[PDB]
């Protein structure tokens, strides 16, 4: 009786930067995190009448 094969099953790596979900993101490199607590983004609306 004889063998006939051991078949390679490789799952390809899928990176985040190439899917166009990243068109709903603004990707910024970010050196450390746990040295930061709670960041902030500030607005200012001046409404003319």
Q: Which residues bind a second copy (CB under 8 A)?
A: 1-11, 36-48
State in angstroms the smallest separation of the CB of 22 from a second copy. Answer: 20
Closer Cβ to a second copy, 17 or 47, answer by number: 47
* DSSP 8-state symbol, 18: T
End-to-end Cα separation, the chain, in angstroms: 90
State in angstroms the smallest separation of the CB of 47 from a second copy. Answer: 8
Task: Provide the CA 14 distance to its chain's centre, in angstroms.
Answer: 11
State in angstroms the smallest separation of the CB of 34 from a second copy. Answer: 13
What gap in Å lies between CA 30 and CA 27, rounded to an integer?
Answer: 9
């Amino acid at each position: 009786e004889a063998l006939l094969g051991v078949y390679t099953n490789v799952v390809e790596f899928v990176k985040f930067l190439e899917t166009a979900l990243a068109a709903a993101c603004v990707n910024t490199e970010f050196k450390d995190l746990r040295r930061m607590i709670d960041g902030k983004i500030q607005f200012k609306i001046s409404m003319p009448t």
